[PDB]
Amino acid sequence: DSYTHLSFYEKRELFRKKLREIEGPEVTLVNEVDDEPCPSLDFQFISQYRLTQGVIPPDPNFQSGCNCSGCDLNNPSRCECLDDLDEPTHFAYDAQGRVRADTGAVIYECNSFCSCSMECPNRVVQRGRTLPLEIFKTKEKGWGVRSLRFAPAGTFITCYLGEVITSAEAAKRDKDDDGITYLFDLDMFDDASEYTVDAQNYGDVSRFFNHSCSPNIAIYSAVRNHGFRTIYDLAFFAIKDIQPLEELTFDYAGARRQCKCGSANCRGWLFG
């Protein structure tokens, strides 16, 4: 540990001040379990993807918007952002701003080219986190995140951010090794599965989400670009009613040694 001249107090205070700099609902850090002061002080919180070399970004000349004069939820036919969806065409969100039960794994939101305001109903992911979260130390896993408010099914939590890297860099970082990884493959679309999100040095609070074989949140691919399927938002949505102080977990598979989730249907392997 290169931070050995800092005290448990100052390191925790420094990480706390790092949390306070995050824009949006507050994020808190508690540790009533062991003596570790905080996660890595070198970690940087970000609000958007951290592209690296070799990662081709979407071309703005291929981008299209909708002509919705924001969009109307009771008339999804007029909006052109939902053309990739089969009939019955509908937005991914209901009147309460939550993802619908019948919505698939791909969410088509509006973008900066639409004639839309920032409070369009199809910009839930873009507006960002609304739930105050708390980072805490768990029993047998590392750090974890729990919600401080009730999160009914369909509530948007946050996105999995970090560096976007190529397959060669992902293998080069596939490994130090201690059973801890922050790599998240962008593999929602098999026709273009090339990049990986690395939350080691840059990332979101979702970087502390743990795995569970009976998860309460799940990933949705929030796509605001045209046909670009190599980079998209990894949006976490609650698939179960999450009560306050309940740990937020998702299936790393997507549906170190053994899994400590403690579910009655634990497969025993994280596979990630």
């Binding site: 039960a101 019948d102 919505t103 698939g104 794994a105 791909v106 999995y160 992902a170 596939d174 990884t181 790599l183 998240f184 493959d185 962008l186 593999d187 929602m188 679309f189 098999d190 990986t196 799940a218 990933i219 949705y220 691919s221 990894l234 949505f237 698939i239 299936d251 790393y252 598979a253 997507g254 549906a255 596979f271 990630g272």
Partner: peptide, 15 residues
């Protein structure tokens, strides 16, 4: 395939 987190693909079962 990998020791990496996956989205599970877009095969529908209602995420």
């Amino acid at each position: 395939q990998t020791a990496r987190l996956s989205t599970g693909g877009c095969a529908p079962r209602k995420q």
